[PDB]
Symmetry: D2
Subunit: 296 residues, 4 copies
């Protein structure tokens, strides 16, 4: 048996590393990749997902999704224009075409086709919120959501908020209230998931995949974000977790905050997320190299 997964992404170098591990691990069956707009437009994140899938010679379908957040106007200060949004390696132009259907339509069809799937959002959550609103019947087919985003110890857009949640707080609130079990892979662990200078050097000489990932990773040691959704699916024993109630702040100066009820004081003992609080960084490094060494 393989675990059926669907990835919703805004590649993005971090998403490229997540997709690399998901595509190549033989215990995972990646059914579908959807994209959302982020630091580049949905047209560019779509092209980037196609570039990674084509690099591995796979025919995994890509569906382009939401061009904008539900409500929060996208910060143009965060919008890179006339660039790829996934720099540091030449993929060529031979990478194929997305589906004609939207990410929401593709998610609905791919989820309803499976008894059980794990959904893995590594961008802002706009497509997931739209999916759950238009097709709430998908939820019984989803075992778990393993989401990159949030922080319980300090943000990156402000002190209070992490990028994926901050980009579409309203979509994050819909996802966090949907009643599907969530694993929160936030900055609490991703800032600890330090790919060492020694690991990054070894990566660049390993094979064509290692050369590609080295190019993306070194373009700007490196904390790895989105790839920890896949590392959690394969090695949950590498993480320390805590079940808690998570609320999304959707306005005011703390817009985009993932607020954890760390005391369990306010929600009558109810939880909606398994929050990732720590990671084995040594095993993450060993794992990352072991996995890439088996690829092209």
């Amino acid at each position: 048996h393989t675990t059926k997964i669907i990835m919703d992404t805004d590649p993005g170098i971090d998403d490229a590393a997540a997709l690399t591990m998901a595509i190549n691990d033989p215990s995972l069956d990646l059914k579908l990749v959807t994209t959302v707009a982020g630091n580049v437009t949905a047209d560019k994140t779509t092209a980037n997902a196609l570039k990674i899938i084509h690099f591995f010679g796979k025919d995994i379908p890509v569906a382009a999704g939401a061009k904008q957040p539900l409500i929060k106007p996208f910060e143009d200060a965060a919008r890179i224009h006339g660039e790829s949004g996934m720099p540091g390696y030449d993929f060529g132009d031979d990478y194929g075409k997305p589906l004609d259907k939207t990410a929401v339509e593709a998610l609905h069809d791919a989820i309803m086709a499976e008894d059980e799937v794990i959904l893995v959002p590594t961008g802002s959550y706009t497509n997931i919120a739209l999916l759950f609103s238009e097709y709430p019947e998908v939820k019984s087919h989803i075992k778990q959501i393993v989401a990159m985003g949030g922080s319980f110890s300090g943000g990156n857009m402000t002190s209070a908020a992490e990028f994926n949640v901050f980009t579409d707080p309203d979509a994050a609130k819909i996802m966090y209230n949907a009643g599907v079990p969530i694993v929160t892979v936030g900055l609490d662990v991703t800032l600890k998931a330090l790919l060492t200078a020694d690991t990054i050097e070894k990566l660049g000489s390993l094979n064509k995949t290692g050369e590609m990932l080295h190019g993306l990773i070194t373009h700007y040691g490196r904390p790895m974000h989105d790839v920890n959704t896949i590392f959690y699916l394969l090695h949950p024993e590498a993480f320390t977790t805590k079940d808690m109630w998570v609320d999304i702040q959707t306005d005011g100066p703390a817009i985009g905050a993932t607020v954890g009820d760390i005391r369990a004081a306010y929600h009558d003992g109810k939880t909606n997320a398994k929050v990732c609080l720590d990671i084995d960084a040594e095993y993450f490094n060993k794992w990352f190299l072991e996995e890439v060494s088996k690829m092209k």
Copy 2:
């Protein structure tokens, strides 16, 4: 010329009267009816739209839409149709095998120009504009039942359709498509008189049907039908272009906040707000239109 219109509804007696006028006026071509959940489930509002369309012998397609608001949990306040006072029978046909969003996307992209007429909460319109922003250049305007600039009905601050899905209303009001706001400011003045309702019941089969719905619960304020009355008789309304914001949290959740002084938005407007109505002409019009029907 005929105006192409698409109606998004939660029938509902008020939506029944709106659909009746839209179906039967020869200057309007109703391409599609979509439904949303409200006082009753999306399954029941879908059945109610199909009952009205079938009553006039039309095969106007119905697509069932959103079962719940985007964010705000629906206030539960069993057994009921949600459109009582007339027996439509069995045999009213079936919805499309796609969502309201998918049906709206296909029907709007097939036309150069359409008018969109939401008479429920705005969930399907917000989902449509988020998933398919390419529809917006095909929409001349939105003529929306909802809001109030002079006192609400769910609270003092908020009208039902906006209150039910404030987040969807915000998405619709920020989408850049021209809006006409048909709020409580005019619908509470659109009083169908006791004399009108009596004449309606004896007029014909449509009059009998509308009489049955209208009198199920002296005179009745009519809501959603004023979107169609606006399309056909804009001269019967007093309007003011203004900036409208949607309050989406706090005690004033669901408020349509009009910048009545134009103090806060650098003179920009996103809505033509209906502030008054010729109630006498509304009554005369309502009877004249129904007299031409079955």
Copy 3:
């Protein structure tokens, strides 16, 4: 045999008419007038209150209060600059001085001196919020608050909000949550309290007070009267239709300054914090206004 009252004001022509009726009614004992900043700064509203009290020759102390709202920055487009903020009559320049103490300190001393008082806020509620936070012991001495402000049917700063609440929504929230009984005299009644052209003509020829009030009333220019309806409520509650309900104050977002009435009683388990004024006998308001001013200087 007199009702002890304290007025917190931002005069303002409407507050001048309220103070006029309160000073001159023999069933009322106006112990103190406090001021808050509004369309003009607190120094100007203080001067305006002193002008009205000095016009009637009374001993009534004035204490200057808050210069700014608690939290919401005062909208500069609503600030009237290099002006009195009470135009249409020259009182001269011999109107006396405020107390040395703040409005809050003067309110605390005047309320604690009475077993029972009625508080009558006709500006924004900044002083009352500060008072209840610093000296919650005053609340057992207050029989009720009769407040000018709010709307349950359309605002004047936006469609959602009335000026006095809009000006300091956080102060209004503190006041509305304080557990002192409130009567809300909002735009629902004040926009119906239309002083007719016939009344305003008769007012100007009545006596010195009528001449002074005519000067203030007709400076911009029939006229809706606001703040004076707090005093008309105290003297003639039979002139009003009221409804006890739960009122929340919106303190942020586009509906900032909204008084939200739970008109269905759906959300508060049947609890009430305000008696909301919904209708007024405008004919009696006119008759009363003329009858009262005819008994003055």
Copy 4:
């Protein structure tokens, strides 16, 4: 040879007791006044606790009791026994009485008496918000506010919010928008300010002050020290890493009580209102704490 004039607003509290100990006894500091606010115990009990500490050192530095409740946010009753709120030592019953005036009134008089003072709030900020609203004239007399509270890396009431800000977010917003320079002594540094087992053992054997502080510090089973870091900042700012930034207070929603730092300087046109403490020399904090207490009774 010259002293810094300071005023402390406190809710003692073991952490405030340690802050007051250092402030009372440092020869470069002149503590003019202590005010109190309600927190984990009532304002009556925090007042008693400040008087106990002052009396322990043979001083009669005045204490003025302040606000009994937050401005707006109902006090979380799960966060309020027949308990002192400062256990682990018998201070006896000879500790004297607070001033008759409120904290606000005492703060206004003490600040206006000085050309320059530093204000040091170690509780929730209710008294400071009321002070700045009623007496904005104090602000030109205040060089700086050195505040215990906030976090830019994880809270203690929720993931988003620290206790002092969470307790009265509205008061914290008024303080952060008042235009007086702020030094933020948040959980970023106070959770690193670990008084070691070795330090706490040496403290207990040092003298009567060390015995008293040992009693309070070891009552609940090193120890992170909070409020005392305001005084450690005043004396040894070189022991801290700071960054000027714009700080907003979240006053509603699930992130209520958050101190939101514009860490990118993306949203406020490069304007700052706070010098945020991000790191501390914990080794020097320990050395300093022992050196200071060794010079006391």
